[model samples]
Target: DCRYMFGDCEKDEDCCKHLGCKRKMKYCAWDFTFT
Candidate 1:
């Protein structure tokens, strides 16, 4: 049940652990919506 919500990530690390997905890669909200 929880696995489905986890989704796909490049690293197995948890996103909530760092508060954001800026650890191993660059991520932006606009990148997905605007760019």
Candidate 2:
């Protein structure tokens, strides 16, 4: 999710589903702005 947001994820799979980490820095960066 966004740099200012927060969530719970036990793995990348979970991460991706919740629109959180997504296991990718670029994705996270985009989330940061979008969130």
Candidate 3:
């Protein structure tokens, strides 16, 4: 069960493709960054 962008996630496995479990709010977010 993966979450989409801005969705809540416990870890990497909890997030969808191209997305990561952000520690900011434990939400699924983009893996790559501009900076």
Candidate 4:
């Protein structure tokens, strides 16, 4: 029910839970950055 990073995705549902699909890249991605 989820895809790893770099995989193609149509929406956030296709990506991992808590994260989302990339807008332009149309790929599964995480929305985190080191502070």
Cα-based TM-score, every candidate = 0.19, 0.26, 0.68, 0.66
- lDDT by residue (tens digit), candidate 2, 1-35: 42322444334334444254434343322132234
Which 10-residue span in candidate 2 carries the lowest summed lDDT? 26-35
What C-alpha lDDT does candidate 1 achieve relative to the native structure? 0.29
List candidate 4 stretches off by more than 4 Å. 32-35
Candidate 4 per-residue lDDT over residues 4-31, each given as its tens digit: 6877788778888766788677787784
Off by over 4 Å in 1: 1-6, 15-35
Give the clashing pairs for model 1.
Answer: none
The predicted structure with the larger lDDT, 1 or 3, is 3
Report each candidate's C-alpha RMSD, comma-separated, in the order given: 9.0, 7.3, 2.3, 3.4
Measured by C-alpha RMSD in angstroms, how accurate is candidate 4?
A: 3.4
Per-residue lDDT tens digits for candidate 3, residues 1-35, read 67888899878778888887787777888862324
Best candidate, TM-score: 3
Clash totals, every prediction: 0, 1, 0, 0
**Candidate 3 accuracy as TM-score:** 0.68
* Candidate 1 per-residue C-alpha lDDT over 1-35 given as tens digits, one digit per residue, 9 for 90 to 100: 11122343433243333333332344311122221
Q: Please tell me which model should have the higher lDDT, number 2 or number 4.
A: 4
